[PDB]
Design a protein around this ligand. Structure first.
Ligand SMILES: [Ca+2]
Length: 586
């Protein structure tokens, strides 16, 4: 393990993180919105699950146009969630339970309601004008409407520019119209961002940051028109000119140094960057400890399978190998380096993993939920569990488009309507996709009980901010699952215990090798840690499936699996439907 610098222990490498979506976790005052007191009341639940740390999605003052990712004040909690003192009390309570606390750092853009933008937009001459990207119209079209500066597409559909009537210029917003991108080319802007979004929270005791689209801060000079790669779209991906831009490492090094110099008590701060896409070299430039940029990053390849590279909301076929390779992209690059990795299948931007990668049928949702737990339990990196994942939550079913809350759905819907028509093949394909892929499958309220109609998320008289998934009535809720010894929740508790007990090879394991990579059912691999070898055989199918252990001998002992412990023949070399097994040899 000496020629593997990645094995050097750190709190944040072996911590299991639980991600909380504050709007949807726990309402304590029956207004239908989750809040900080609600979260505080459930910290013991999170600890009992086996989490070592929490990441809370944005809880700062925000109009909620992107449900918190449009921040109007980095230094003030959104009043509906509580006060700043509520937040400080929550951080302290988390700490006193022996858990770490990370906050969401969203500094590619802020809300147009942020005072910085209110000043910026007020005139062309004010000191904050170039804290954002302002450009005149390219011209005017045949109807007299201003034409945006370039052809860039918003992440949520349509143009990535919004026209300001007062100053007669467009401003850049890669996200929704009220999320103006901050101009990192302006050094005063960078310094103000660090003070407000970073320093304030360091001063108030956070253990780290999850960094929202951290790979977008560097725009290529001139903001040039992007390549026309999508021949059926007016607007084009800006990735060549906005993703991992030429100053992106400079900016991350600078912010890393700011953090190092601002911490007052010598504590170790973790940063996890939501970087989206990166070559392995780019990942290394970001996460190598010697680079002093990020601790680790999220890479989306595994959550992109089954979606078109041109448009997330067009489905395409995939096979198991595609997902195997995409998952391995998270961690193989760290082998024999001072880099570090993340491991996750769910977050507030993703549909449910059982639906996507297991089988959410009444017959298979429990066993396949456990299979996914077995897989994640064995992988190298910082493990993240998203609220409800531990319950085996599944996608919602048969929702009309008008029920979806997400701006990503609303904006894409409207762009398709405008470009192709409401009654079009393009719309049909979109509607097909949202049923599988929408971020909203992550965002329905957390299911605490079977109580009608709000599942213990709020009192029965409240109107939740977003609709409940009907699954709470099918026993997918905390109260019912605690009592069912066979539940997905109780299994996740086991899986985290197993992972911790074997952390050298589960968390810190190296030399990952696939076994039978092409197999459309069997997901199998080995890992090493000194004299130890871990072997996984995971059957992602409703069929029985054979496997082989390479260099098999008597030393391989069955240590974890999802079929009943007393009813498994460890010597058998055929897996039952949805069966997973982890063997370890010493
Ligand atoms: Ca509330």
């Amino acid at each position: 393990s000496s020629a593997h610098p990645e094995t050097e222990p750190k709190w944040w490498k072996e911590a299991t993180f639980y991600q909380i979506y504050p709007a949807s976790f726990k309402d304590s005052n029956d207004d239908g919105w989750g809040d900080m007191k609600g979260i505080a009341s459930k910290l013991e639940y999170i600890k009992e699950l086996g989490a070592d740390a929490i990441w809370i999605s944005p809880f700062y003052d925000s109009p909620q146009d992107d449900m918190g990712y449009d921040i109007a004040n980095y230094e003030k909690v959104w009043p509906t969630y509580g006060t700043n003192e509520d937040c400080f009390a929550l951080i302290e309570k988390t700490h006193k339970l022996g858990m770490k606390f990370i906050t969401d750092l969203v500094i590619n853009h802020c809300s147009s309601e942020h005072e910085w933008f209110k000043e910026s937009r007020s005139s062309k001459t004010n000191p904050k004008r170039d804290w954002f990207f302002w450009r005149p119209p390219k011209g005017y079209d045949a109807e007299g409407k201003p034409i945006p500066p370039n052809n860039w597409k918003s992440y949520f559909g349509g143009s990535a520019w919004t026209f300001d009537e007062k100053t007669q210029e467009f401003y850049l917003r890669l996200f929704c119209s009220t999320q103006p991108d901050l101009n990192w080319e302006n050094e005063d802007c960078r310094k103000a961002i660090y003070e407000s979004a970073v320093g304030y929270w360091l001063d108030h005791g956070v253990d780290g940051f999850r960094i929202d689209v951290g790979s977008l801060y560097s725009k290529v000079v001139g903001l040039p028109d992007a390549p026309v790669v999508d021949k059926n779209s007016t607007w084009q991906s800006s990735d060549p000119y906005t993703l991992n831009g030429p100053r992106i490492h400079e900016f991350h090094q600078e912010m890393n140094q700011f953090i190092r110099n601002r911490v007052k008590d010598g504590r170790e701060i973790m940063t996890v960057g939501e970087m989206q896409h990166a070559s392995d070299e780019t990942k290394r430039l970001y996460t190598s400890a010697s680079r002093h940029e990020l601790s680790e990053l999220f890479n989306f390849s595994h959550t992109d399978v089954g979606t078109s590279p041109l448009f997330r909301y067009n489905l395409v076929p995939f096979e198991l190998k595609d997902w195997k390779i995409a998952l391995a992209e998270l961690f193989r690059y760290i082998n024999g380096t001072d880099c570090w990795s993340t491991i996750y299948l769910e977050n507030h931007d993703q549909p449910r993993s059982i639906t996507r990668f297991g089988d959410d049928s009444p017959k298979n949702r429990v066993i396949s939920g456990k299979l996914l737990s077995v897989l994640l339990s064995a992988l190298t990196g910082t493990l993240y569990v998203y609220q409800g994942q531990e319950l085996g939550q599944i996608n919602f079913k048969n929702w009309p488009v008008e029920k979806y809350e997400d701006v990503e759905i609303r904006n894409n819907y409207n762009a398709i309507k405008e470009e192709h028509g409401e009654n079009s093949e393009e719309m049909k394909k979109f509607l097909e996709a949202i049923a599988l892929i929408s971020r909203d499958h992550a965002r329905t309220p957390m299911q605490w009980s079977r109580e009608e109609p709000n599942a213990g998320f709020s009192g029965p008289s409240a109107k939740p901010w977003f609709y409940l998934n009907d699954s709470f009535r099918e026993g997918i809720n905390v109260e019912d699952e605690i009592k069912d010894p066979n539940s997905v929740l109780n299994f996740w508790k086991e899986a985290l215990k197993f992972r911790k007990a074997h952390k050298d090879i589960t968390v810190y394991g190296y030399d990952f090798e696939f076994i039978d990579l092409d197999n459309k059912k069997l997901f199998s691999f080995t890992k090493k840690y000194n004299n130890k070898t871990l072997f996984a055989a995971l059957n992602f199918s409703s069929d029985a499936t054979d496997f082989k252990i390479p260099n098999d001998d008597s030393s391989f002992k069955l240590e974890f699996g999802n079929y009943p412990k007393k009813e498994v023949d460890a010597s058998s070399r055929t897996l039952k439907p949805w069966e997973g097994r982890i063997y370890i040899s010493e």
